[PDB]
Write a protein that binds this DNA or RNA. Structure first.
Length: 111
DNA sequence: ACGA
């Protein structure tokens, strides 16, 4: 929804070693339940933000690839829920608003 | 539906 929230939800400096543990955070609760999916971008905030430089309002597909760790919910249980993990290096699509990534829009391509 |  905004740059601060995008960073808090999607940007981390080190690789995810356990999706179950990282997803156990109230930031990933929507509608009272554990979120369906969340992609972690293993990079610095500055490098991710650079995707949006010069972009005022549009989805942008990054020109460089990023190391990604995607956590996908396997079952809706009382917190903490179980998640499966997928790792890949790929371009990412983010919504750029006023030069800031504000929403994670896709992996490999924009919608 | 990985934000309004």
């Amino acid at each position: 929804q905004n740059w601060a929230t995008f960073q808090q939800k999607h940007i981390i400096n080190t690789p995810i070693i356990n999706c179950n543990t990282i997803m156990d955070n109230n930031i990933y609760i929507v509608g009272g339940q554990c979120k369906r999916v969340n992609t972690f971008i293993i990079s610095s905030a500055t490098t991710v933000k650079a995707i949006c430089t010069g972009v005022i309002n549009m989805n942008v597909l990054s020109t460089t690839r990023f190391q990604l760790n995607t956590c996908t919910r396997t079952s809706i249980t009382p917190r903490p829920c179980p998640y499966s993990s997928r790792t890949e290096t790929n371009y990412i699509c983010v919504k750029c608003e006023n030069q800031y990534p504000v929403h994670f829009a896709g992996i490999g391509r924009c919608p």
